[PDB]
């Protein structure tokens, strides 16, 4: 449901008829794992059979696709792939079986599950440790560099927990060197850094006093005001919202020659979206973005004035662990986007012939099936062609030399 609508339009003129073709994705249906033989029959699969015959313990996934034919003058379950099933989970066949049928199924009652069976080989996903998102971290740059402190934040949307953008606020100028200690802010899809006053005005707060009101929270602290003074002096050249947005729009890495109004619209787009996306995405909600910018600049100043130590990178409460869930979610997002692009390409090719496509031919379940199977079998957590420069060892063969080693391998990070 992240991208639930594929859209194809065709302003046919061959009596102008504007036709829109669009397909919607509905419900997801899952089943218990099944095994399909060469003679064509099917039967319920159990993990011992998959281990003995070098099968993959996986279940089919069905998706409801609804097709509509929009025209202006001026659909059932499709199999999208097979997902490997983790043993002893809610979707495993061994979850229900009691102690006696577990013995009849040749399963050990001491076995705990938590692994997958790909081609008869037991694979365990290793938890990946990453830094937390949506937190401001202030660091000190080393001596052979004009930058003395940096304040970086990585933003991730709550739905899906996926990284979107990274924004930094560098503090140029060394102690007693480089004249003024200007504060430049790095922005996404912008080729060169930007002083904080210009972007602050671009968000829609012009007066310098209110910029200081947003940044600082105690007027008697003359030192932070002194450190902000060079930024005010540098940004004094810009004094209006619209010229500030235009200045944003010139450096926005877009195609050369864009007109001024379109540049301003592009700046408005790149400012509303992709600038601190975790805060908000709608228009006219930039007050919170200005307050958060003031908070980041305040943290940068507090660290720069030796009032606080730089953030501990190795602190464990600032780290996160990715279990089977998030890793499989990222992998499935990539594979589903690939499948959607394939469906789009096939639809574009088919509209040339102008036929009432079954829609059970556009979908290639082999994409998701092979991608998941390859990633779990080899441990390379990405597309097969993208194996170079990709994370490796995320999936390993389960250790079975002794029971304690199996437990340790199942609880590793």
């Amino acid at each position: 449901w992240e991208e639930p609508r594929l859209i194809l339009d065709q302003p046919a003129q061959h009596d102008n008829i504007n036709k829109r073709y669009e397909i919607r994705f509905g419900k997801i249906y899952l089943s218990r794992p099944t095994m399909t033989e060469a003679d064509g029959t099917t039967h319920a699969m159990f993990p011992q059979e998959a281990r003995l015959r070098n099968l993959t313990y996986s279940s089919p996934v069905y998706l409801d696709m609804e097709k509509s034919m929009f025209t202006s003058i001026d659909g059932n379950k499709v199999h999208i792939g097979k997902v490997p099933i983790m043993l002893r989970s809610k979707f495993c066949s061994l979850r229900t079986l009691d102690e006696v049928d577990l013995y009849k199924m040749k399963e050990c009652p001491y076995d705990m599950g938590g692994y997958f069976v790909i081609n008869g080989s037991e694979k365990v996903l290793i938890a990946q440790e990453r830094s937390a998102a949506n937190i401001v971290q202030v660091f000190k740059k080393a001596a052979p560099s004009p930058i003395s402190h940096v304040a970086e934040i990585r933003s991730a949307l709550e739905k899906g927990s996926r990284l979107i953008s990274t924004m930094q606020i560098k503090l140029y100028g060394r102690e007693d060197k480089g004249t003024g200690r200007t504060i430049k802010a790095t922005l996404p899809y912008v080729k060169q850094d930007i002083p904080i006053v210009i972007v602050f005005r671009a968000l829609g707060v012009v007066p310098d006093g209110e910029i200081l009101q947003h940044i600082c929270y105690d007027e008697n602290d003359w030192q932070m005001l002194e450190m902000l003074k060079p930024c005010i002096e540098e940004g004094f050249v810009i004094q209006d919202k619209e010229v500030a947005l235009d200045f944003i729009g010139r450096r926005g890495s877009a195609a050369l020659g864009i007109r001024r109004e379109k540049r301003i619209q592009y700046a408005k787009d790149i400012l509303q979206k992709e600038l601190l996306p975790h805060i908000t995405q709608e228009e006219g909600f930039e007050t919170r973005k200005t307050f958060f910018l003031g908070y980041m600049v305040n943290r940068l100043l507090l660290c720069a004035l030796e009032r606080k130590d730089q953030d501990d990178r190795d602190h464990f409460g600032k780290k996160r662990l990715d279990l089977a869930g998030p890793l499989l979610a990222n992998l499935f997002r990539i594979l589903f986007r690939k499948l959607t692009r394939e469906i789009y390409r096939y639809m574009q090719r088919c509209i040339e012939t102008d036929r009432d496509f079954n829609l059970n031919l556009a979908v290639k379940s082999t994409t998701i099936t092979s991608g998941l199977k390859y990633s779990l079998a080899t441990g390379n957590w990405g597309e097969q062609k993208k194996a170079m420069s990709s994370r490796a060892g995320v999936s390993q063969v389960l250790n079975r030399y002794t029971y304690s080693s199996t437990l340790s391998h199942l609880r590793r990070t």
Partner: protein, 45 residues
């Protein structure tokens, strides 16, 4: 000519290198060869 045993119902049968590898009675896809007839001796040590 060669004896087998089903992996599910432990039924014995034979194959002639032309039948599908399946159990006759319960249709399991997993079968095992029977133990040889040669003499088996151990040194009890």
């Amino acid at each position: 000519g060669v004896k087998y045993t089903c992996g599910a119902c432990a039924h014995n049968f034979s194959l002639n290198k032309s039948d599908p590898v399946r159990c006759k009675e319960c249709g399991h896809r997993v079968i095992y060869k029977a133990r040889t007839k040669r003499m088996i001796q151990f040194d009890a040590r």
